[PDB]
Amino acid sequence: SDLELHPPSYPWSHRGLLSSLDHTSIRRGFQVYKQVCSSCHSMDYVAYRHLVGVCYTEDEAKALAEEVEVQDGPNEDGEMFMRPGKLSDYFPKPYPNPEAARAANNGALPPDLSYIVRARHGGEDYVFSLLTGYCEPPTGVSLREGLYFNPYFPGQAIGMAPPIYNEVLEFDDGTPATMSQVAKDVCTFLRWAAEPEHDHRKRMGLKMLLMMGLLLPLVYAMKRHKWSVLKSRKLAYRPPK
Amino acid sequence: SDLELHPPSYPWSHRGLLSSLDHTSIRRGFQVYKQVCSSCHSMDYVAYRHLVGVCYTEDEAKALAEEVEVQDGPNEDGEMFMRPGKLSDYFPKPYPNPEAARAANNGALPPDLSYIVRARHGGEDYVFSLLTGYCEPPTGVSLREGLYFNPYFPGQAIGMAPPIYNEVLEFDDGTPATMSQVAKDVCTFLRWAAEPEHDHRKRMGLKMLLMMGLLLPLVYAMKRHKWSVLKSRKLAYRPPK
Amino acid sequence: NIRKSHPLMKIVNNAFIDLPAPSNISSWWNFGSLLGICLILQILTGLFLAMHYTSDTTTAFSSVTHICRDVNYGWIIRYMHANGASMFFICLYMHVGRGLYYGSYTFLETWNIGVILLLTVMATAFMGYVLPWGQMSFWGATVITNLLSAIPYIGTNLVEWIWGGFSVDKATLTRFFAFHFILPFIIMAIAMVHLLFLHETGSNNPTGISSDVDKIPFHPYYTIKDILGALLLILALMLLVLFAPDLLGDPDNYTPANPLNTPPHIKPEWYFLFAYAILRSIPNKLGGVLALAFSILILALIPLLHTSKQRSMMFRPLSQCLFWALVADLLTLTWIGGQPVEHPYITIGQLASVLYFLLILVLMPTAGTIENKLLKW
Amino acid sequence: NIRKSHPLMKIVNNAFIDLPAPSNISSWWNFGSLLGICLILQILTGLFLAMHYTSDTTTAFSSVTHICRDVNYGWIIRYMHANGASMFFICLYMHVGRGLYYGSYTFLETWNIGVILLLTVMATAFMGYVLPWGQMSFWGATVITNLLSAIPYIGTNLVEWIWGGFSVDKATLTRFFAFHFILPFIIMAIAMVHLLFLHETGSNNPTGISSDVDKIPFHPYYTIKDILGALLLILALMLLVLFAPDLLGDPDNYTPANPLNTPPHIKPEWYFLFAYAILRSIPNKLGGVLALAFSILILALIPLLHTSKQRSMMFRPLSQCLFWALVADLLTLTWIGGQPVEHPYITIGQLASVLYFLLILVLMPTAGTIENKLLKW
Amino acid sequence: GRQFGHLTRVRHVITYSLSPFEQRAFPHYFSKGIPNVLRRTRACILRVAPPFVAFYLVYTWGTQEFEKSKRKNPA
Amino acid sequence: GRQFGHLTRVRHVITYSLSPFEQRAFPHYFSKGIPNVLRRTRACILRVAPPFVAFYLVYTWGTQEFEKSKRKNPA
Numbered sequence A, B: 001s002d003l004e005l006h007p008p009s010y011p012w013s014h015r016g017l018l019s020s021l022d023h024t025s026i027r028r029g030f031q032v033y034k035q036v037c038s039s040c041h042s043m044d045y046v047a048y049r050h051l052v053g054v055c056y057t058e059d060e061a062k063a064l065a066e067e068v069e070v071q072d073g074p075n076e077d078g079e080m081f082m083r084p085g086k087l088s089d090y091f092p093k094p095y096p097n098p099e100a101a102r103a104a105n106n107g108a109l110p111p112d113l114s115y116i117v118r119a120r121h122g123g124e125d126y127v128f129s130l131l132t133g134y135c136e137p138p139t140g141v142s143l144r145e146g147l148y149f150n151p152y153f154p155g156q157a158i159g160m161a162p163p164i165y166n167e168v169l170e171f172d173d174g175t176p177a178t179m180s181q182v183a184k185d186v187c188t189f190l191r192w193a194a195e196p197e198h199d200h201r202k203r204m205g206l207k208m209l210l211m212m213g214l215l216l217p218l219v220y221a222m223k224r225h226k227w228s229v230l231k232s233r234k235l236a237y238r239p240p241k
Numbered sequence C, D: 001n002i003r004k005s006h007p008l009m010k011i012v013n014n015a016f017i018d019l020p021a022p023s024n025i026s027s028w029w030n031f032g033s034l035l036g037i038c039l040i041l042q043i044l045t046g047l048f049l050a051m052h053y054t055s056d057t058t059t060a061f062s063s064v065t066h067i068c069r070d071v072n073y074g075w076i077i078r079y080m081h082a083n084g085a086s087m088f089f090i091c092l093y094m095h096v097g098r099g100l101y102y103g104s105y106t107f108l109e110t111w112n113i114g115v116i117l118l119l120t121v122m123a124t125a126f127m128g129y130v131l132p133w134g135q136m137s138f139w140g141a142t143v144i145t146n147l148l149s150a151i152p153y154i155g156t157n158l159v160e161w162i163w164g165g166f167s168v169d170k171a172t173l174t175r176f177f178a179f180h181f182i183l184p185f186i187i188m189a190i191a192m193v194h195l196l197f198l199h200e201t202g203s204n205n206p207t208g209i210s211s212d213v214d215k216i217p218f219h220p221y222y223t224i225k226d227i228l229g230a231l232l233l234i235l236a237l238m239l240l241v242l243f244a245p246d247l248l249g250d251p252d253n254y255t256p257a258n259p260l261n262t263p264p265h266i267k268p269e270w271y272f273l274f275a276y277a278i279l280r281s282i283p284n285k286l287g288g289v290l291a292l293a294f295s296i297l298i299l300a301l302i303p304l305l306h307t308s309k310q311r312s313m314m315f316r317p318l319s320q321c322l323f324w325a326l327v328a329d330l331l332t333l334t335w336i337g338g339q340p341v342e343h344p345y346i347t348i349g350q351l352a353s354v355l356y357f358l359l360i361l362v363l364m365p366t367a368g369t370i371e372n373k374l375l376k377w
Numbered sequence E, F: 001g002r003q004f005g006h007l008t009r010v011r012h013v014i015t016y017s018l019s020p021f022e023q024r025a026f027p028h029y030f031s032k033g034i035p036n037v038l039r040r041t042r043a044c045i046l047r048v049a050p051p052f053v054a055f056y057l058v059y060t061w062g063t064q065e066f067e068k069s070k071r072k073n074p075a
């Protein structure tokens, strides 16, 4: 029941109606999630195979899956065991359940991020503004220990410490890992995570507009063609006198 | 692809069309399952509460559930833990999965018993004959170590050692725990486990027969009543000459 | 001629080909067939979703996800079905508004079962929105089902009997999926009785005057206009599917259902917001529920409120203005319904709520009596 | 009189009340309405099962268990639905046999869509038996779906396209449940077209002679006989439900599906055993499948094989004997179908298989030509 | 459809009928009923029974062979 | 239902019609079309616009009040 400040609209390169995602920024954004976010945030609905042909090759994505160990089994003795990930595995969860998560994060629950952009008003505008929007509390607000001031979060008191900062990681293509850079890349990746169909739907949308621009006047012309018999008909009344 | 010997028909007291189960024998049969069978055989579809008002009181069945420990959780720290059973718990599984079961039973899988009477031709006649039908192998059959001769089992070689014998348990009501007694009681319980609706369906069946014995001749009488106009009609042909 | 004598093609002929129709019915008469198309789309997209959806709380949220990510072209099927439902309600509300403005309600049998067709679609889309099992799905399902607890004496029994428990849970999601599957076929059956009674008289037209002196065959004139209209219906749908799929959907529904806390502000889909406003306009439980029922069942008694010696509003300016004050008033109640119960939205919601019932029950009936006297009859 | 002029009650009147019917139709004409009743029962028991059943392999077996143990009176609903399906096939086979013996197939339109009504019911009960996901459900589903792999060139593509994978798995169980839900409504629609074409002519009767000289109204004479028949239909069902529910069901279906090993001997439900026998009677893949299709599609070309100048077999002793040799022959093929492919059941299955097609295609057509010449015309 | 009054043409045929409340719904149910059932079965038994007896003989022979075909012989 | 030839009675009315292949489907589409749209909107604007302007004024006032009603005052 506090005052709200809504995020402005940043000019993402995928904002326009026909504008695709930038897949190099996705690639960088996955690197942010893996190294920084995945230790607190799950992504229960994304698997390594989804990366293939979007931002990594099959060989690259396979090598990426094998960099972590996942549980499998039972074997012939009835025991569970660990093996390296394969393309079919979903991204490892950091905690077995949310109760462990609250205990590891001063009682707060980092939500799953698979859909985070779609489950909050403002999408990447909100997330970009949140990550890059931390500041000292205004005069008269004193937050309990464990909590951090962030003016874009409802109530302005969030249980997540600022998770990104200059040089948290180095990008593979040499791009300077500035806070704003890291925010932009991770936000583009999170859009893709929530809406992998983004680019394909816009390509279809273009084809739908072009076909409609053809079919609407042609079907209109067929309507007018048949109806012209009636629209130009003339009547006369000739009663006997 | 061996020769088969099918079980004879024993005169169970629930064999007749209108004949209910003997609930004292059910009660004894549960005691056989708990003490002898439950260490190798699961019953994934029966819970302690199903016993209430059939063969144990609510207080008795509650005390029975608390005699075992079951897993529950998570608690507020995210850890799983053990507590005593309650009425809502299903009967504990002896193994977490079938792979552990084969390893603990020389490679064979004791099936779940919730439906055993319905998943094999001959029902309790088969099970009664199997348990009580072990004997020395005939001349010329030599079974590999680990396997036991039983002429009612397909192939005559079963991976289950004879599980019941004189005095495996003592019954609460003093009944002599003879092999045949134990077989009869456990078989009655297993019928109940597979078909708890047994008694209620026969009570309904009796009401259905009585109502039909009334309604069939009355509805027949209404048919004949209306149709009598036609069945006794007389025709005459009087053409002009 | 076989088109006129084959017992099967006879019924098709007398309904789509040689059926006499007025020569002057405008685009507002296109929405009857667009409702049929909308229904067909919701059958087909609905059916192909039901081949990949699972009906239990543990994986109901995940099975919808599984469609939008893993099955070929299931995300487009799913948004067609979601936005198809909203297009269905656009067409429904134009269909009804056409009937009121031009006086088509005088076809009592056709109209009175049309009301039934409205209720069953609402009941369908209600039990459809529960299935993805998001937050809005769960608590929107909670607010609605508890409306029956307001009935005196038997209230709680009907709710817990509907629930199959003590709250909306696994047992509700399963039966609601069963109901959502079967109701759209009942709808199609009643829509066929809708047409049967309609053909008894034929269509009204913009003037309210009998068109027997000047009819044209339905084919080719209205077959092609219904095609053109449908092509504009596909356009509306595909713009929503392919350029704005989450415009009408609420973000909160993208978080799995949590039976322990609500969102700070819940809002129905747009097509129910006007009625939710009427519910909240009363600080009484049973009062709010009855005002909600009569909000829709008011349609059943429109024909009893017709006072004009003319049928259509085309020649009734004073009724036109009161008609558009009702659309604006309904557009007002939609706005309140999407806003939190706070000042001044509360008092606005009550004034617009009275104006709704005041127009239908008082101002429009007497407005027709005036203009009769202005015309000396 | 409103019963004759209300546009809705008019269609009821001309179908159940004032419809002229022959005065002499026997109990073999009762099975038309019992099929309708059977359908209604399978809708209702089916619907109330779908409110507690879940459609995924992990808990599909367990949800049916959950019905028979935990939900109030769900075990009786479930056996009604299982045995109701078998009663459906009893009535189907009497219905067809009535049509053949008494020559009702000369109603081509009614008959030829009747064949369609047979296929769709088989397709329904097939996709119903898969849902509990027992052993017989799984491997019976495997044998059937692989019949399409016999089609040259496009075989494997249609199977894997039906499967949604490389074998019957989670994706099939979900769509099969969707198909099993929707098909019984399509059936009801086609059953309505069944009656529409029927009323074009009215009923045949035991004699094969026109009954126009002596008709009686359907009400009260055949309304009460259809009630009495239905009461005997409930008796048959309830004896199976309440005294022998697992008589027709196979025990193997009470073990969850295992995609790794089969049972040593699999047998369909009784109502498909005659056709399974025909399939196995041929040591060829594509040959067995085609012989299976023509086994049922033989009905479509019965009307082309009518040679008698009389319509019914009531006055044709030589056709009567060949008719009952077909019932016994079909009863033979049912027995083989329930037995393992071993000596002498194999060779018996082939002789009974030829006798089936030999009777319909040769012996019965020529038998009608003989008795025409015995009667000098 | 078809209606009463448009079916066919009939002339010179008289029908006498009695009310259903004036007569008995089961008149001579066993007196005349059983002899009629005997006539009806007698008239059709030779056309129905043989093929089902033929089935019975094949059914017993086929099972009798199969039930013992898997017995062992000394060779 | 209703059929052509049983609708109503008409006398002394002549209808001239031209084939659709002899005439233009878009004749004077903008020449005569736009002035007709202006006449049609002019004739109805006073009956439709006021209630929706009335809604617009309530909509801006209500949000303007609410958007600032939760601001703080010095007291």
Ligand SMILES: CCCCCCCCCCCCCCCCCC(=O)OC[C@H](COP(=O)(O)OCCN)OC(=O)CCCCCCCCCCCCC
Binding pocket: C028, C093, C094, C096, C097, C098, C100, C101, C206, C271, C274, C313, C314, C315, C327, C330, C331, C334, F040, F044, F048
């Ligand atoms: C219960 C559901 C509530 C849900 C809330 C929905 C939000 C409402 C958003 C408002 C959208 C309005 C659509 C645009 C309407 C423009 C109409 C116009 O341009 O022309 C007025 C026309 C006059 O034309 P005449 O027929 O009199 O004669 C013509 C002579 N050349 O007269 C006509 O054409 C009028 C025909 C009827 C119009 C249908 C719109 C009404 C929609 C809701 C009605 C529900 C009432 C219960």
Ligand SMILES: CCCCCCCCCCCCCCCCCC(=O)OC[C@H](COP(=O)(O)OCCN)OC(=O)CCCCCCCCCCCCC
Binding pocket: D028, D093, D094, D096, D097, D098, D100, D101, D206, D271, D274, D313, D314, D315, D327, D330, D331, D334, E040, E044, E048
């Ligand atoms: C394709 C499916 C295969 C599935 C296999 C099913 C297993 C078969 C089990 C056999 C059950 C047989 C039912 C009992 C029939 C007894 C008939 C009898 O008692 O009377 C013969 C009767 C003669 O009477 P009329 O009509 O000539 O004149 C009467 C003058 N008082 O004449 C009539 O009443 C005959 C009317 C028709 C009888 C219907 C039975 C046929 C069932 C399958 C036919 C499928 C063919 C494709």
Ligand code: HEC
Binding pocket: A032, A033, A036, A037, A038, A039, A040, A041, A105, A108, A109, A110, A111, A116, A120, A127, A131, A153, A154, A157, A158, A159, A160, A161, A163, A164, A186
């Ligand atoms: C990659 C750098 C990260 C992004 C992007 C986000 N985080 Fe976190 N996070 C953490 C906790 C304990 C919470 C719960 C806070 C609360 O409920 O009060 C969160 C929550 C979020 C949210 C939700 C915001 C909202 O609900 O409106 C977002 C959008 C989010 N986080 C983005 C903890 C951690 C953490 C542990 C050290 C890390 C490394 C990250 N978060 C990383 C990211």
Ligand code: HEC
Binding pocket: B032, B033, B036, B037, B038, B039, B040, B041, B105, B108, B109, B110, B111, B116, B120, B127, B131, B153, B154, B157, B158, B159, B160, B161, B163, B164, B186
């Ligand atoms: C209560 C005394 C018991 C009853 C009743 C049954 N058993 Fe057992 N069982 C065990 C194994 C290792 C197997 C698998 C054997 C194989 O697959 O070859 C079984 C199996 C059964 C069966 C299935 C018979 C069939 O498939 O036809 C039945 C009906 C059965 N058992 C009845 C092992 C054990 C065991 C471990 C020491 C005990 C205590 C029991 N079984 C007890 C019972």
Ligand code: HEM
Binding pocket: C028, C029, C030, C031, C032, C033, C035, C036, C092, C095, C096, C099, C104, C105, C107, C110, C111, C113, C114, C115, C117, C118, C121, C187, C191, C194, C198, C202, C203, C204, C205, C299
């Ligand atoms: C699934 C729901 C519905 C379908 C498929 C449907 C379909 C149709 C169709 C095709 C027509 C004739 C063509 C036309 O006028 O557009 C029609 C007419 C009509 N409908 Fe509906 N309708 C539905 C719901 C309703 C509702 C909700 C109402 C009113 C509350 C209603 C009342 C009427 C009336 C009065 C007419 C006659 C209009 C006239 O001929 O002037 N119907 N409907």
Ligand code: HEM
Binding pocket: C038, C039, C042, C043, C045, C046, C047, C049, C050, C053, C064, C078, C081, C082, C084, C085, C088, C121, C124, C125, C128, C129, C130, C131, C132, C180, C181, C184, C185, C187
């Ligand atoms: C007039 C007819 C129908 C309407 C208005 C309608 C409407 C809806 C709506 C609004 C949703 C919510 C979608 C979402 O929030 O994601 C939904 C979901 C669903 N509908 Fe329907 N529906 C109709 C018919 C059908 C039919 C006939 C079927 C199946 C045979 C069906 C199957 C489903 C399924 C499985 C879902 C859950 C998947 C999902 O949420 O997308 N629907 N429906």
Ligand code: HEM
Binding pocket: D028, D029, D030, D031, D032, D033, D035, D036, D092, D095, D096, D099, D104, D105, D107, D110, D111, D113, D114, D115, D117, D118, D121, D187, D191, D194, D198, D202, D203, D204, D205, D299
């Ligand atoms: C769901 C499936 C079906 C339903 C509900 C149904 C229902 C009916 C009904 C009510 C009648 C009129 C009353 C009677 O004669 O009993 C009838 C007649 C008829 N049916 Fe069906 N039937 C079905 C399937 C079939 C099949 C499988 C066939 C043939 C292969 C068939 C062929 C016929 C014929 C030829 C008649 C005319 C009988 C006569 O009037 O003498 N129908 N059906």
Ligand code: HEM
Binding pocket: D038, D039, D042, D043, D045, D046, D047, D049, D050, D053, D064, D078, D081, D082, D084, D085, D088, D121, D124, D125, D128, D129, D130, D131, D132, D180, D181, D184, D185, D187
């Ligand atoms: C002519 C119509 C129908 C026939 C012949 C039919 C037949 C069957 C059969 C033979 C089974 C297997 C039962 C078992 O093995 O346990 C079954 C299962 C099932 N049927 Fe149907 N059915 C029909 C209509 C319906 C309808 C309309 C629905 C739902 C709206 C439905 C829902 C179900 C469900 C949920 C199951 C799985 C539960 C179970 O196995 O008992 N059925 N059906």
Ligand SMILES: CSC1=N[C@@](C)(c2ccccc2)C(=O)N1Nc1ccccc1
Binding pocket: C122, C123, C125, C126, C127, C129, C130, C136, C137, C138, C139, C140, C141, C142, C143, C144, C266, C267, C268, C269, C270, C272
């Ligand atoms: C079941 S959640 C739901 N179903 C809808 C689509 C619906 C409700 C009533 C009638 C038709 C459709 C709707 O708007 N909501 N949301 C919602 C939010 C808050 C309160 C009530 C419903």
Ligand SMILES: CSC1=N[C@@](C)(c2ccccc2)C(=O)N1Nc1ccccc1
Binding pocket: D122, D123, D125, D126, D127, D129, D130, D136, D137, D138, D139, D140, D141, D142, D143, D144, D266, D267, D268, D269, D270, D272
């Ligand atoms: C899908 S398992 C199955 N469905 C049935 C009910 C069916 C099959 C075909 C047509 C209608 C109904 C049937 O008999 N079986 N069993 C079975 C066993 C072995 C081989 C084939 C089927």
Ligand SMILES: [Cl-]
Binding pocket: C061, C064, C065, C132, C253, C254
């Ligand atoms: Cl979702």
Ligand SMILES: [Cl-]
Binding pocket: D061, D064, D065, D132, D253, D254
């Ligand atoms: Cl089961």
